[PDB]
Structure formats: structure tokens, C-alpha cells
């Protein structure tokens, strides 16, 4: 069983610029572990697989969250530290293009369809329960949990938005953009680490270590 009310409760429970952005991400990694614990059946998975899922999904999970948090922001994002990053600042740090992708493919699309916190929660749980993650001891159990989240999401959408039959598909079709954006953000992060002039705190650093 996978109740959207429990998923929503999980979301509501946890509520230069590059340095600030790295600080914010590290801070949210701690909060992400707490969120994952509150998603039904996640804690019941083997500890090793909980580790694999969070290492594989953390970046997309945190990008999804700050993107939705930033819907009321004009041409920018709100970080978990309370700091704002705007287009001008991102451009001036040499990361304009990827920043614009986030705004156009995530923040604005979330704003325009008025994605609610239940929908965001379920999208994140779908991302969390990724059966493609390498080294999972039981991919089928993870896949079964993903299936239960999206069956639950679909029913929620059709109940709450009965005249938007394409809504459920539209939500899931943000996931390729999120995948793509996550990969590019991670690529930048490894470069920041390579140069060594940006403070990267311990939990973020741990996520960067090699399997």
C-alpha cells in the first residue's frame, strides 16, 4: 500500500553563488534522509539498498525540491539556506545556461501546471524507487514500490483534476528533463571539486566519492 497522504506528510515534514549553492545542497542531504524514512516501505528495504537508492537519486531529488520551492520566485531559485539565486548571478558565475534550463524546463513548467505538493512528493518517490540503480539486491521489490507510487499518483490526479486526463502523463514527462538536468549539475559539481576553490562539505563530498 502507498497512500498519497503519507507521501504528502513526508514532503510537509521536511519544509559566489556556487559556494552558497554547494552549502545549500549539503544541508538538504541531511533533510533528504529524513524524507526518505517517511516514504512508506522505504525503511523496510535492506540498509544497503536504501544507501544505493539515495546515492543514485539524491541529485534529482534535491533539484525537484528546490525547483518546486522556487515557483513564486521571479527569474530565480530559493535555496534551503534562505538565499536566492537569480539569472544575473548565475550568468555572472559562468553557469547561466544550466540555470536557464532549470527555470524553463522545471520551475516554469511546475508553475504553469500548478504542480501541487502531493504530485511533487509522488514524483520524488518514483525517482527514489529507481529499479535501474546498480547493485540493488532486489530490483523487483524496488520496482514494485515504484509501481505502487504511480498507481497512487494516477488515482490522485484523476480524482483531484478530473478534466485534465493528460495530467498524470505530463507529470511523468518532466522526469527526462530532471534526469538530464541532474547529470549536467553533477558534471559541474565534479568540476568545482577538481578546481578545489569551492568549499564542499562532508555529506556532499561523500556523495561524490567513487563506488
Amino acid at each position: 500500500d502507498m497512500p498519497v497522504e503519507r507521501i504528502l506528510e513526508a514532503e510537509l515534514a521536511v519544509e559566489d553563488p556556487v559556494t552558497n549553492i554547494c552549502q545549500a545542497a549539503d544541508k538538504q542531504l541531511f533533510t533528504l534522509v529524513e524524507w526518505a524514512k517517511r516514504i512508506p516501505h522505504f525503511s523496510e528495504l535492506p540498509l544497503d539498498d536504501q544507501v544505493i537508492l539515495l546515492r543514485a537519486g539524491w541529485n534529482e531529488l534535491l533539484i525537484a525540491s528546490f525547483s518546486h520551492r522556487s515557483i513564486a520566485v521571479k527569474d530565480g531559485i530559493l535555496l534551503a539556506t534562505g538565499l536566492h539565486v537569480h539569472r544575473n548571478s548565475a550568468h555572472s558565475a559562468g553557469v547561466g545556461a544550466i540555470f536557464d534550463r532549470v527555470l524553463t524546463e522545471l520551475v516554469s513548467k511546475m508553475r504553469d501546471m500548478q504542480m501541487d505538493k502531493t504530485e511533487l512528493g509522488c514524483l520524488r518517490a518514483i525517482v527514489l524507487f529507481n529499479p535501474d540503480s546498480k547493485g540493488l539486491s532486489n530490483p523487483a521489490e524496488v520496482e514494485a514500490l515504484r509501481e505502487k507510487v504511480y498507481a497512487s499518483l494516477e488515482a490522485y490526479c484523476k480524482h483531484k483534476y478530473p478534466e485534465q486526463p493528460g495530467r498524470f502523463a505530463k507529470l511523468l514527462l518532466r522526469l527526462p528533463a530532471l534526469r538530464s538536468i541532474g547529470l549536467k549539475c553533477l558534471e559541474h559539481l565534479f568540476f568545482f571539486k577538481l578546481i578545489g576553490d569551492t568549499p564542499i562539505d562532508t555529506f556532499l563530498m561523500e556523495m561524490l566519492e567513487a563506488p
Binding site: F30, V33, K37, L47, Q50, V51, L54, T202, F203, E206
Partner: peptide, 10 residues
């Protein structure tokens, strides 16, 4: 991955 294991256990 020490921090993740620690936070998930407790």
C-alpha cells in the same frame, strides 16, 4: 559511505 549509513540506521 559513513554519514549516509549512520543517518539511516539512526
Amino acid at each position: 559511505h559513513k554519514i549516509l549509513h549512520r543517518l539511516l540506521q539512526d
